[PDB]
Amino acid sequence: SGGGVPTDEEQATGLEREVMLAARKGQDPYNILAPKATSGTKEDPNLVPSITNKRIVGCICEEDNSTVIWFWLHKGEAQRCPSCGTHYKLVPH
Amino acid sequence: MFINRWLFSTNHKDIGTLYLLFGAWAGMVGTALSLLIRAELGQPGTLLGDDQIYNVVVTAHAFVMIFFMVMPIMIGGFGNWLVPLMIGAPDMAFPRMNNMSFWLLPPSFLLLLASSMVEAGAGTGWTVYPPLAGNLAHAGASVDLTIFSLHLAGVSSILGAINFITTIINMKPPAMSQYQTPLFVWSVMITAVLLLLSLPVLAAGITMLLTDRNLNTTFFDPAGGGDPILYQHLFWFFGHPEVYILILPGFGMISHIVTYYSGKKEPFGYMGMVWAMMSIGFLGFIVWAHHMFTVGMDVDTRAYFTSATMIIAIPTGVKVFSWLATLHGGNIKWSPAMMWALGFIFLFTVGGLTGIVLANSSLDIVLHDTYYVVAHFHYVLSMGAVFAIMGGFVHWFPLFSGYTLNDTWAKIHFAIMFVGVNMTFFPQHFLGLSGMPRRYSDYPDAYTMWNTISSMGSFISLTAVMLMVFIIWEAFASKREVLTVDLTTTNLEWLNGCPPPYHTFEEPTYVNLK
Amino acid sequence: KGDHGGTGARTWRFLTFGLALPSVALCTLNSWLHSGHRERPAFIPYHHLRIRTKPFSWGDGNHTFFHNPRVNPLPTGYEK
Amino acid sequence: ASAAKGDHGGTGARTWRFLTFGLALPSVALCTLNSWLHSGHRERPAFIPYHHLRIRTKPFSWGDGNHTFFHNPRVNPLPTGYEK
Amino acid sequence: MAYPMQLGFQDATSPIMEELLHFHDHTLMIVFLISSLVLYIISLMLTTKLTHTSTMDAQEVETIWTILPAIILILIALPSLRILYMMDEINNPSLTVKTMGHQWYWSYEYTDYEDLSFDSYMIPTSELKPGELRLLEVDNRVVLPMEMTIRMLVSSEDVLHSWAVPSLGLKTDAIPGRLNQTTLMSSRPGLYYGQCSEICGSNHSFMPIVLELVPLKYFEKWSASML
Amino acid sequence: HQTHAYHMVNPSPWPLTGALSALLMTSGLTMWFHFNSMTLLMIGLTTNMLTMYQWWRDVIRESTFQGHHTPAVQKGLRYGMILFIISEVLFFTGFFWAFYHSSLAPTPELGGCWPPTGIHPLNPLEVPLLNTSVLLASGVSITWAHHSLMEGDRKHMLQALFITITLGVYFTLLQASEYYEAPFTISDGVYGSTFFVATGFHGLHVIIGSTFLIVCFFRQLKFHFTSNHHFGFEAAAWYWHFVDVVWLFLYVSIYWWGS
Amino acid sequence: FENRVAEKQKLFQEDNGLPVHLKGGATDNILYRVTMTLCLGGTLYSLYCLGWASFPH
Ligand SMILES: CCCCCCCCCCCCCCCCCC(=O)OCC(COC(=O)CCCCCCCCCCCCCCCCC)OC(=O)CCCCCCCCCCCCCCCCC
Ligand code: HEA
Ligand code: HEA
Ligand SMILES: CCCCC/C=C\C/C=C/C/C=C/C/C=C\CCCC(=O)O[C@H](COC(=O)CCCCCCCCCCCCCCCCC)COP(=O)(O)OCCN
Ligand SMILES: CCCCCC/C=C\CCCCCCCCCC(=O)O[C@H](COC(=O)CCCCCCCCCCCCCCC)COP(=O)(O)OC[C@@H](O)CO
Ligand SMILES: CCCCCCCCCCO[C@@H]1O[C@H](CO)[C@@H](O[C@H]2O[C@H](CO)[C@@H](O)[C@H](O)[C@H]2O)[C@H](O)[C@H]1O
Ligand SMILES: CCCCCCCCCCO[C@@H]1O[C@H](CO)[C@@H](O[C@H]2O[C@H](CO)[C@@H](O)[C@H](O)[C@H]2O)[C@H](O)[C@H]1O
Ligand SMILES: C[C@H](CCC(=O)O)[C@H]1CC[C@H]2[C@@H]3[C@H](O)C[C@@H]4C[C@H](O)CC[C@]4(C)[C@H]3C[C@H](O)[C@]12C
Ligand SMILES: C[C@H](CCC(=O)O)[C@H]1CC[C@H]2[C@@H]3[C@H](O)C[C@@H]4C[C@H](O)CC[C@]4(C)[C@H]3C[C@H](O)[C@]12C
Ligand SMILES: [C-]#N
Ligand code: CUA
Ligand SMILES: [Cu+2]
Ligand SMILES: [Mg+2]
Ligand code: NA
Ligand code: NA
Ligand SMILES: [Zn+2]
């Protein structure tokens, strides 16, 4: 046995390295994981990160629905899914 | 910048646009060929005075319509434009390889042109059976250029299948399971699996034809212990999957169009629709010998292939009834795309039914190699595929271009086409039942009346094609820019506007798990 | 063919009800359609058949364990 | 299954090197012996111009058109028989 | 042969073709029904202002949409397979005739006793006798005895062809290196016509088949006269 | 600008040069078979190799040097290579179907027997068995290479990969010699046709797979692979196992059962 | 041999606007022009051969 093979910690670069570093911190800036829903009430809305002022949400209103409900979520007051009413609130950066 | 954008593309929408342009151009070629067929048959006697040329026209008509019109439009055009948008993905998995699947098609089509220009062309039928297609009955380069055209088309589609399967499996939002993807995306996935498995078998068979013609192999030559019938098995082992490949993306588009213009958020019976397409895909590999009921097969084999073939009508019927159940209770919008989709349902059903007639090997003895088969497949496949293509094109043209069509003109175009294709192909059932062979340049005099009517029909559809070109021109000429569309909550491809920006989903959708 | 993402419980139930049990039903049809007794062949006392080197440890020693009088001849032929 | 080893535990690099040098390369050495013992030229068979062999439906695209690509004069007769 | 404005099958000349006609009548009714039901339902779904756009449960109705088509297919397959197995059943013919396809004509061999063979070419339109049929006549017809079970063996000496006679329900591909068998039995005397049914090159449209069915005693005199 | 992990590829000329290479190779084969000229074919082979070299060079630049192969991108490439191998399995399936069709029902022109009259097969216990031990052994050595890489051991990865490539080259040279020594030819009816086309396509895949292993060897000499990220090596090993399994099917079917 | 991957990472990440197929420097441009000239000229040559082969010669 012997060494001489670089590790990812040593040699990963670019976006690969950013994803690796973020994963160590437990963060998901590149949207690799599915977010877990809150209760979705007005008091406990689902918090939707965005780098901008609007992002498309898809809502799978009940588990196992095959129809996904899509809409732009805008910064400001929380909006509700037009099918199930669950609340979403944009959280820029 | 032009060359970078349109020759060096790595963008799914621009590559989709290239495929739609290519497929539309090929559609003109294939239509011209079909009009030459029907001109030769439009009165008794000879028109071209060269029945080898007639056979070359028939063969090229089919290769053009299948490999250069339907598959590039459905999979390369609608698939590239729509699949990434419908799953919120930023492009295809292999965006550079995708461009090579496109760029292989103009050389493939050039090889087909070359085949028809050298020697006396490949007057083989699109099946290319030896020994007619071998080096004694088709000496010279034409058949070899046809084989190479198919090789390039096959590589393009195999790599495209790898791309679509990978994209659909790997690039959906993390919360979206396969059972949350739209039916068009399912239809493309299944079509791609069929292409992946079936085209390599065709590639093997046509390569053995190439080596029998040029390297003194004898795979299909009995003098060496070969067998012409082995070629037929290899060809049809691909060719049955191929007919489902040609229609499955059409089924996907029809599900979306019928849902949309019924004012519904979803198709009836989503999981049944997925089941039905998977079942058709699977059964589509075990029925091919129904193209071979007159070659001399054992009776028990004929019985098995009759029975397996009829089993496919069950999952197909689920889809037909489910489209009817999607209409059920709808706020029906009588848009031109809806008319195309309703025409598709009816004409596909007629053609599928005559296919069920043909599935009975006893009756197929009498109907094989007659115009009954030509009528079956111009209903169920040729005009099924064309009507789904026109429905999708009318429905999504405003997304791809940013401009609206004139709906009254588009309805006129539908009406002309519906008349024309029915006048062309319905009388071919009578020709087949009364025994007229296919692949003939002239016919006994008894068959004159229905041939005359069928050829008159072909000119009506020509008038429709010319009108379609004018309608597209009128939309680009007038520049009515889209503002809004309804039902965006269940039609994600529209939510980035019209046309969507070059890059979409740079920030992916947010979809949680509850 | 298709799905290939997650092979979870939902996919395996889909395969059970959508492919596996339909296949069993089709084969059950196929079988209960070729069923029906077929003519038993002429008895011929071939020496490589109906072997008896020791009596069976049940019955009269001369009947196989799942003897079916309709289709299983004894060494002396079919039973009456 | 009809093997006869043991190790398992972990299959790591050391185990696969052990297999490479202890089983795989010795097997290649033995078949190289077996083969370099049954090497040698047998007596070629009488030529018979069977019509299912030496097929020529189009000339080959090299040489004189009548020689296969890896033609061996010692063992490959032409349609007319062995070469002199 | 076909006649002007014909819509269905040529009249049956053999019992098997009769069976096919009745089986076709049975199946075409089903095709008509299903096609008109789909058309009807399309119009039924499109002709009400009443709506129901919320999610609809699909399980109950999908049982109907699978079980009924399965029953219908079985009701087609049963007579279809009975006819298939009838065709294949042992017949013991009295005569064997071979046909060899060529580009572009048929040859016939009657080698049970005598070694009779001949070629059979289409009559060009310029040579037809008045009232003869364009693209259908041949110079030498396949003389055969009526009301007798005949074995036809079909092959080719070049490319694929296919030997067909619609009114007898016959189509058997002609493949070089292969000897395909079919059985022929005409209930009636007469002239029965067919056309090459696998694309075989430029004159595929112009190599017809013409059977001439006559009583056995006349078949024997014709055979004898060939000596 | 993106907040997904996928790779937006720079606009590239290699799809077009690859597609034109295909036009030149196919029109080139046509001109060679029919018009006694190798010109177009030589240009097409050259442009094909240039296109492959530059395209895969760019994939290395995008991944080792630029960092674009996130885990999501790597997972896509895993699916892509599996799907590609599946399509190559179906291509060989067509040649096995031709072989079994002809050998299970030998026609009268063969003598009605298999092997045909006048065919004298190779002894499968001679060079064909040696070739089988060679490819099986190289499946063991490539697995040693893979584990050495995962365990961070540069020297033993390189030794094991070198042994694997040496065995692939040995197979190729043994098969070239067998082709020359074979007393039957591709023109020897369906026996020669199935033998040389099926084993020839396999030999092409051995050369392709050996070349891919050689690329991996040089990339390893240049330290491109990490102990956890080395998909080019994984893909070349999957392809190499595919080439080994196709050989085992050829050996059992054509050389042994078909002798 | 020494691990020089970091130096190639710095080269291919330099913000010079070059697409990856040219980012290695002048040699990339040469190989590109060679490849493209062979492809386009060979394609023109293939079209000539088509014209030649389309007529009896
Ligand atoms: C169906 C596609 C649409 C296009 C329809 C155009 C044609 C209209 C028919 C529209 C309705 C079609 C009915 C069949 C027409 C011929 C009647 C007949 O006696 O056919 C019998 C047989 C053979 O029968 C015989 O053994 C000879 C019987 C002849 C003796 C009586 C003489 C007079 C009968 C009247 C015939 C009229 C000639 C039609 C000449 C037509 C020239 C164009 O022919 C056949 O098998 C034809 C095989 C067709 C297979 C597909 C059937 C499903 C589609 C139609 C139903 C959907 C709803 C249509 C509703 C239509 C909505 C648009
Ligand atoms: C889009 C292309 C397409 C599609 C989808 C089909 C679908 C079918 N095809 Fe067709 N076919 C072709 C294109 C296609 N075909 C082509 C091109 C050829 C000829 C190739 C050549 O030789 O060049 C051909 C040839 C062909 C033959 C060979 C005939 C011969 O050469 O003698 C046969 C035989 O069985 C056949 C049968 C069928 C069947 C049973 C279906 C089924 O999948 C149809 C199922 C659909 C329905 C049945 C209708 C909807 C169902 C319901 C409303 C439910 C209730 C119905 C019942 C209970 C019956 N087809
Ligand atoms: C997709 C497949 C397809 C399509 C669309 C068509 C279209 C047509 N075909 Fe078809 N045809 C075949 C596939 C197809 N055909 C095949 C496989 C064969 C068998 C070949 C063989 O025997 O080897 C055949 C054979 C065949 C024959 C039998 C020849 C013979 O046996 O001798 C005839 C005869 O009338 C015929 C006529 C027509 C006509 C009149 C049309 C059309 O004119 C009908 C009107 C349709 C159109 C005009 C389509 C226009 C669409 C576009 C222009 C796309 C526009 C694009 C965008 C909007 C993005 N075809
Ligand atoms: C060392 C092990 C082998 C390594 C590979 C060596 C070269 C083989 C190349 C493989 C290409 C495989 C194509 C198979 C075509 C036939 C070649 C078969 C293998 C071979 O090399 O066969 C030789 C014949 O080659 C001949 O004809 C000439 C063959 C050259 C011309 C081939 C032209 C045809 C290529 C068409 C390819 C189509 C591919 C399409 C892919 C599409 C997939 C989507 C056998 O020589 P022989 O003298 O007859 O008998 C030996 C007597 N001592
Ligand atoms: C009769 C003679 C006919 C001759 C016809 C010859 C036709 C074609 C000329 C071919 C020129 C090939 C040039 C190299 C192509 C490499 C493609 C490749 O490697 O594609 C990759 C994807 O396919 C993957 O992995 C998995 C797939 C790899 C495929 C590699 C190329 C295969 C070409 C032959 C295909 C048919 C195979 C046989 C099937 C029967 C990468 O995808 P990109 O989108 O590029 O990048 C994505 C980035 O994230 C990477 O950093
Ligand atoms: C840098 C870009 C510019 C590159 C230009 C390349 C120009 C090449 C022109 C030469 O053409 C060659 O002529 C040969 C003889 O005239 C041919 O051999 C042919 O004739 C031979 C006679 O020796 C036979 O042995 C061969 O089998 C047969 O292929 C050969 O095929 C063909 O290519
Ligand atoms: C990057 C751009 C590359 C562009 C392509 C290069 C163009 C090459 C021009 C040379 O053309 C050659 O001319 C020869 C005639 O002089 C031909 O020989 C052929 O014709 C001869 C007769 O002159 C015979 O000996 C043989 O059939 C054969 O060798 C051969 O086919 C052909 O290629
Ligand atoms: C179990 C599976 C998926 C259910 C889901 O998880 O949503 C469903 C989807 C489609 C269903 C099938 C289709 O509805 C077609 C058939 C309908 C019959 O009523 C039962 C068998 C039948 C073959 C169904 C079995 C099963 O309920 C399927 C396969
Ligand atoms: C030079 C290099 C040392 C690793 C490093 O560069 O530090 C060593 C390590 C392993 C060596 C290789 C491996 O031992 C495998 C080969 C062994 C052959 O006997 C010589 C060439 C051969 C290919 C070696 C060449 C060279 O000496 C290598 C490549
Ligand atoms: C239809 N096949
Ligand atoms: Cu002979 Cu068609
Ligand atoms: Cu089919
Ligand atoms: Mg046929
Ligand atoms: Na005509
Ligand atoms: Na690994
Ligand atoms: Zn919701």
PDB file of N, CA and C in Angstrom, chain D residues 11-13 16-17 20-21 24 28 32 34-35 38 50 52-56 58 61 68 71-72 75-76, chain F residues 32-33 109 117 125-127 130 133 137 140-141 143-144 147 151 156 170 180-183 185 187-189:
ATOM      1  N   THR D  11     -13.292  -7.352   0.633  1.00  0.00           N
ATOM      2  CA  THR D  11     -12.619  -7.389  -0.655  1.00  0.00           C
ATOM      3  C   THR D  11     -12.073  -5.977  -0.903  1.00  0.00           C
ATOM      4  N   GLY D  12     -10.788  -5.788  -0.556  1.00  0.00           N
ATOM      5  CA  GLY D  12     -10.032  -4.600  -0.884  1.00  0.00           C
ATOM      6  C   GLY D  12      -8.946  -4.800  -1.937  1.00  0.00           C
ATOM      7  N   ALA D  13      -8.090  -3.797  -2.059  1.00  0.00           N
ATOM      8  CA  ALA D  13      -7.060  -3.853  -3.095  1.00  0.00           C
ATOM      9  C   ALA D  13      -6.107  -5.013  -2.869  1.00  0.00           C
ATOM     10  N   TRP D  16      -7.674  -8.146  -4.183  1.00  0.00           N
ATOM     11  CA  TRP D  16      -7.724  -8.257  -5.630  1.00  0.00           C
ATOM     12  C   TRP D  16      -6.350  -8.381  -6.261  1.00  0.00           C
ATOM     13  N   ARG D  17      -5.324  -7.829  -5.635  1.00  0.00           N
ATOM     14  CA  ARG D  17      -3.969  -8.089  -6.104  1.00  0.00           C
ATOM     15  C   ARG D  17      -3.623  -9.571  -5.900  1.00  0.00           C
ATOM     16  N   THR D  20      -5.134 -11.413  -8.544  1.00  0.00           N
ATOM     17  CA  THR D  20      -4.497 -11.141  -9.845  1.00  0.00           C
ATOM     18  C   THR D  20      -3.246 -11.990 -10.002  1.00  0.00           C
ATOM     19  N   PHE D  21      -2.389 -12.001  -8.982  1.00  0.00           N
ATOM     20  CA  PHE D  21      -1.133 -12.721  -9.089  1.00  0.00           C
ATOM     21  C   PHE D  21      -1.219 -14.191  -8.677  1.00  0.00           C
ATOM     22  N   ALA D  24      -5.269 -15.328 -11.377  1.00  0.00           N
ATOM     23  CA  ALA D  24      -5.588 -14.916 -12.745  1.00  0.00           C
ATOM     24  C   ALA D  24      -4.375 -15.054 -13.646  1.00  0.00           C
ATOM     25  N   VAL D  28      -3.492 -17.602 -16.891  1.00  0.00           N
ATOM     26  CA  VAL D  28      -3.030 -17.166 -18.195  1.00  0.00           C
ATOM     27  C   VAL D  28      -1.738 -17.877 -18.562  1.00  0.00           C
ATOM     28  N   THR D  32      -1.318 -20.410 -21.641  1.00  0.00           N
ATOM     29  CA  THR D  32      -0.307 -20.025 -22.603  1.00  0.00           C
ATOM     30  C   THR D  32       0.555 -21.248 -22.896  1.00  0.00           C
ATOM     31  N   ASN D  34      -0.558 -24.637 -22.374  1.00  0.00           N
ATOM     32  CA  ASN D  34      -1.468 -25.487 -23.133  1.00  0.00           C
ATOM     33  C   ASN D  34      -1.459 -25.085 -24.609  1.00  0.00           C
ATOM     34  N   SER D  35      -1.579 -23.777 -24.876  1.00  0.00           N
ATOM     35  CA  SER D  35      -1.667 -23.312 -26.256  1.00  0.00           C
ATOM     36  C   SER D  35      -0.325 -23.489 -26.977  1.00  0.00           C
ATOM     37  N   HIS D  38       0.041 -27.186 -28.265  1.00  0.00           N
ATOM     38  CA  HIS D  38      -0.829 -27.600 -29.354  1.00  0.00           C
ATOM     39  C   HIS D  38      -0.695 -26.669 -30.544  1.00  0.00           C
ATOM     40  N   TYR D  50     -16.583 -26.515 -52.935  1.00  0.00           N
ATOM     41  CA  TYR D  50     -17.948 -26.405 -52.430  1.00  0.00           C
ATOM     42  C   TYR D  50     -18.550 -25.023 -52.727  1.00  0.00           C
ATOM     43  N   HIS D  52     -20.973 -23.454 -51.257  1.00  0.00           N
ATOM     44  CA  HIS D  52     -21.343 -22.639 -50.105  1.00  0.00           C
ATOM     45  C   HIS D  52     -20.147 -21.999 -49.460  1.00  0.00           C
ATOM     46  N   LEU D  53     -18.950 -22.167 -49.980  1.00  0.00           N
ATOM     47  CA  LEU D  53     -17.732 -21.638 -49.386  1.00  0.00           C
ATOM     48  C   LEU D  53     -17.053 -20.810 -50.464  1.00  0.00           C
ATOM     49  N   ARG D  54     -16.040 -20.035 -50.076  1.00  0.00           N
ATOM     50  CA  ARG D  54     -15.342 -19.175 -51.037  1.00  0.00           C
ATOM     51  C   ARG D  54     -16.311 -18.311 -51.865  1.00  0.00           C
ATOM     52  N   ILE D  55     -17.304 -17.746 -51.152  1.00  0.00           N
ATOM     53  CA  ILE D  55     -18.367 -17.027 -51.827  1.00  0.00           C
ATOM     54  C   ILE D  55     -17.798 -15.791 -52.511  1.00  0.00           C
ATOM     55  N   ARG D  56     -18.238 -15.536 -53.762  1.00  0.00           N
ATOM     56  CA  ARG D  56     -17.834 -14.328 -54.492  1.00  0.00           C
ATOM     57  C   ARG D  56     -19.078 -13.809 -55.221  1.00  0.00           C
ATOM     58  N   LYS D  58     -19.431 -10.240 -55.200  1.00  0.00           N
ATOM     59  CA  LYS D  58     -18.901  -8.972 -55.670  1.00  0.00           C
ATOM     60  C   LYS D  58     -17.424  -8.997 -55.346  1.00  0.00           C
ATOM     61  N   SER D  61     -12.920  -5.104 -52.255  1.00  0.00           N
ATOM     62  CA  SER D  61     -12.471  -3.750 -52.608  1.00  0.00           C
ATOM     63  C   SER D  61     -10.979  -3.519 -52.322  1.00  0.00           C
ATOM     64  N   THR D  68      -9.333 -12.721 -49.598  1.00  0.00           N
ATOM     65  CA  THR D  68      -9.914 -12.158 -48.379  1.00  0.00           C
ATOM     66  C   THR D  68      -8.893 -11.270 -47.655  1.00  0.00           C
ATOM     67  N   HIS D  71      -6.118 -13.084 -45.904  1.00  0.00           N
ATOM     68  CA  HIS D  71      -5.796 -14.272 -46.687  1.00  0.00           C
ATOM     69  C   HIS D  71      -4.462 -14.865 -46.259  1.00  0.00           C
ATOM     70  N   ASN D  72      -4.486 -16.168 -45.985  1.00  0.00           N
ATOM     71  CA  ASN D  72      -3.275 -16.918 -45.628  1.00  0.00           C
ATOM     72  C   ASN D  72      -3.086 -17.980 -46.706  1.00  0.00           C
ATOM     73  N   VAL D  75      -3.397 -21.823 -45.875  1.00  0.00           N
ATOM     74  CA  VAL D  75      -4.609 -22.486 -45.404  1.00  0.00           C
ATOM     75  C   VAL D  75      -5.887 -21.972 -46.047  1.00  0.00           C
ATOM     76  N   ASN D  76      -5.839 -20.899 -46.835  1.00  0.00           N
ATOM     77  CA  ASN D  76      -7.069 -20.348 -47.405  1.00  0.00           C
ATOM     78  C   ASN D  76      -7.031 -20.572 -48.917  1.00  0.00           C
TER      79      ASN D  76
ATOM     80  N   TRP F  32     -15.287   3.670 -51.445  1.00  0.00           N
ATOM     81  CA  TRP F  32     -14.336   2.564 -51.421  1.00  0.00           C
ATOM     82  C   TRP F  32     -14.958   1.299 -51.999  1.00  0.00           C
ATOM     83  N   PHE F  33     -16.188   0.959 -51.574  1.00  0.00           N
ATOM     84  CA  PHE F  33     -16.856  -0.241 -52.099  1.00  0.00           C
ATOM     85  C   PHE F  33     -17.208  -0.133 -53.587  1.00  0.00           C
ATOM     86  N   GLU F 109     -27.757 -26.312 -48.321  1.00  0.00           N
ATOM     87  CA  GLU F 109     -26.537 -25.867 -48.966  1.00  0.00           C
ATOM     88  C   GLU F 109     -25.335 -26.093 -48.060  1.00  0.00           C
ATOM     89  N   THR F 117     -20.529 -28.705 -43.907  1.00  0.00           N
ATOM     90  CA  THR F 117     -19.522 -29.489 -44.588  1.00  0.00           C
ATOM     91  C   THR F 117     -18.404 -28.580 -45.089  1.00  0.00           C
ATOM     92  N   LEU F 125     -10.212 -25.278 -27.167  1.00  0.00           N
ATOM     93  CA  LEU F 125      -9.305 -25.463 -26.064  1.00  0.00           C
ATOM     94  C   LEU F 125      -7.935 -24.905 -26.363  1.00  0.00           C
ATOM     95  N   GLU F 126      -7.724 -24.328 -27.554  1.00  0.00           N
ATOM     96  CA  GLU F 126      -6.388 -23.819 -27.870  1.00  0.00           C
ATOM     97  C   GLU F 126      -6.393 -22.283 -27.659  1.00  0.00           C
ATOM     98  N   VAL F 127      -6.137 -21.472 -28.698  1.00  0.00           N
ATOM     99  CA  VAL F 127      -6.097 -20.006 -28.478  1.00  0.00           C
ATOM    100  C   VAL F 127      -7.395 -19.437 -27.961  1.00  0.00           C
ATOM    101  N   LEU F 130      -7.202 -19.675 -24.293  1.00  0.00           N
ATOM    102  CA  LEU F 130      -6.236 -18.700 -23.798  1.00  0.00           C
ATOM    103  C   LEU F 130      -6.830 -17.281 -23.796  1.00  0.00           C
ATOM    104  N   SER F 133      -9.043 -16.894 -20.786  1.00  0.00           N
ATOM    105  CA  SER F 133      -8.306 -16.644 -19.539  1.00  0.00           C
ATOM    106  C   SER F 133      -7.715 -15.233 -19.504  1.00  0.00           C
ATOM    107  N   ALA F 137      -8.774 -12.690 -16.700  1.00  0.00           N
ATOM    108  CA  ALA F 137      -7.746 -12.184 -15.795  1.00  0.00           C
ATOM    109  C   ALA F 137      -7.736 -10.659 -15.787  1.00  0.00           C
ATOM    110  N   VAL F 140     -10.102  -9.290 -13.334  1.00  0.00           N
ATOM    111  CA  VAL F 140      -9.557  -9.293 -11.982  1.00  0.00           C
ATOM    112  C   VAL F 140      -8.602  -8.121 -11.801  1.00  0.00           C
ATOM    113  N   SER F 141      -7.686  -7.909 -12.765  1.00  0.00           N
ATOM    114  CA  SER F 141      -6.720  -6.836 -12.580  1.00  0.00           C
ATOM    115  C   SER F 141      -7.362  -5.452 -12.606  1.00  0.00           C
ATOM    116  N   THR F 143     -10.259  -4.746 -11.444  1.00  0.00           N
ATOM    117  CA  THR F 143     -10.868  -4.604 -10.121  1.00  0.00           C
ATOM    118  C   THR F 143      -9.836  -4.287  -9.054  1.00  0.00           C
ATOM    119  N   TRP F 144      -8.636  -4.860  -9.136  1.00  0.00           N
ATOM    120  CA  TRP F 144      -7.528  -4.451  -8.287  1.00  0.00           C
ATOM    121  C   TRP F 144      -7.224  -2.970  -8.521  1.00  0.00           C
ATOM    122  N   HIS F 147      -9.896  -0.752  -6.763  1.00  0.00           N
ATOM    123  CA  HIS F 147      -9.747  -0.693  -5.322  1.00  0.00           C
ATOM    124  C   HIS F 147      -8.501   0.088  -4.910  1.00  0.00           C
ATOM    125  N   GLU F 151      -8.518   3.387  -2.504  1.00  0.00           N
ATOM    126  CA  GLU F 151      -7.686   3.367  -1.308  1.00  0.00           C
ATOM    127  C   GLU F 151      -6.533   4.353  -1.407  1.00  0.00           C
ATOM    128  N   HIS F 156       0.059   1.222  -7.099  1.00  0.00           N
ATOM    129  CA  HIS F 156      -0.616  -0.025  -7.419  1.00  0.00           C
ATOM    130  C   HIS F 156      -1.771   0.171  -8.379  1.00  0.00           C
ATOM    131  N   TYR F 170      -2.716  -8.218 -25.487  1.00  0.00           N
ATOM    132  CA  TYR F 170      -2.404  -9.632 -25.733  1.00  0.00           C
ATOM    133  C   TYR F 170      -3.592 -10.302 -26.403  1.00  0.00           C
ATOM    134  N   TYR F 180      -5.472 -14.612 -38.987  1.00  0.00           N
ATOM    135  CA  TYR F 180      -4.546 -15.009 -40.053  1.00  0.00           C
ATOM    136  C   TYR F 180      -4.461 -16.526 -40.204  1.00  0.00           C
ATOM    137  N   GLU F 181      -4.411 -17.295 -39.081  1.00  0.00           N
ATOM    138  CA  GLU F 181      -4.254 -18.754 -39.147  1.00  0.00           C
ATOM    139  C   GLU F 181      -5.534 -19.496 -39.490  1.00  0.00           C
ATOM    140  N   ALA F 182      -6.701 -18.838 -39.346  1.00  0.00           N
ATOM    141  CA  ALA F 182      -7.952 -19.538 -39.552  1.00  0.00           C
ATOM    142  C   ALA F 182      -7.991 -20.058 -40.985  1.00  0.00           C
ATOM    143  N   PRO F 183      -8.373 -21.313 -41.183  1.00  0.00           N
ATOM    144  CA  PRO F 183      -8.462 -21.858 -42.535  1.00  0.00           C
ATOM    145  C   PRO F 183      -9.763 -21.530 -43.207  1.00  0.00           C
ATOM    146  N   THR F 185     -12.716 -18.273 -43.871  1.00  0.00           N
ATOM    147  CA  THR F 185     -12.704 -16.826 -44.122  1.00  0.00           C
ATOM    148  C   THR F 185     -14.101 -16.261 -43.985  1.00  0.00           C
ATOM    149  N   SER F 187     -15.789 -15.183 -46.250  1.00  0.00           N
ATOM    150  CA  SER F 187     -16.555 -15.565 -47.430  1.00  0.00           C
ATOM    151  C   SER F 187     -16.978 -17.031 -47.373  1.00  0.00           C
ATOM    152  N   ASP F 188     -16.668 -17.731 -46.258  1.00  0.00           N
ATOM    153  CA  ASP F 188     -17.002 -19.150 -46.136  1.00  0.00           C
ATOM    154  C   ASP F 188     -18.404 -19.350 -45.558  1.00  0.00           C
ATOM    155  N   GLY F 189     -19.365 -18.858 -46.331  1.00  0.00           N
ATOM    156  CA  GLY F 189     -20.744 -19.015 -46.073  1.00  0.00           C
ATOM    157  C   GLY F 189     -21.137 -18.347 -44.769  1.00  0.00           C
TER     158      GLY F 189
END
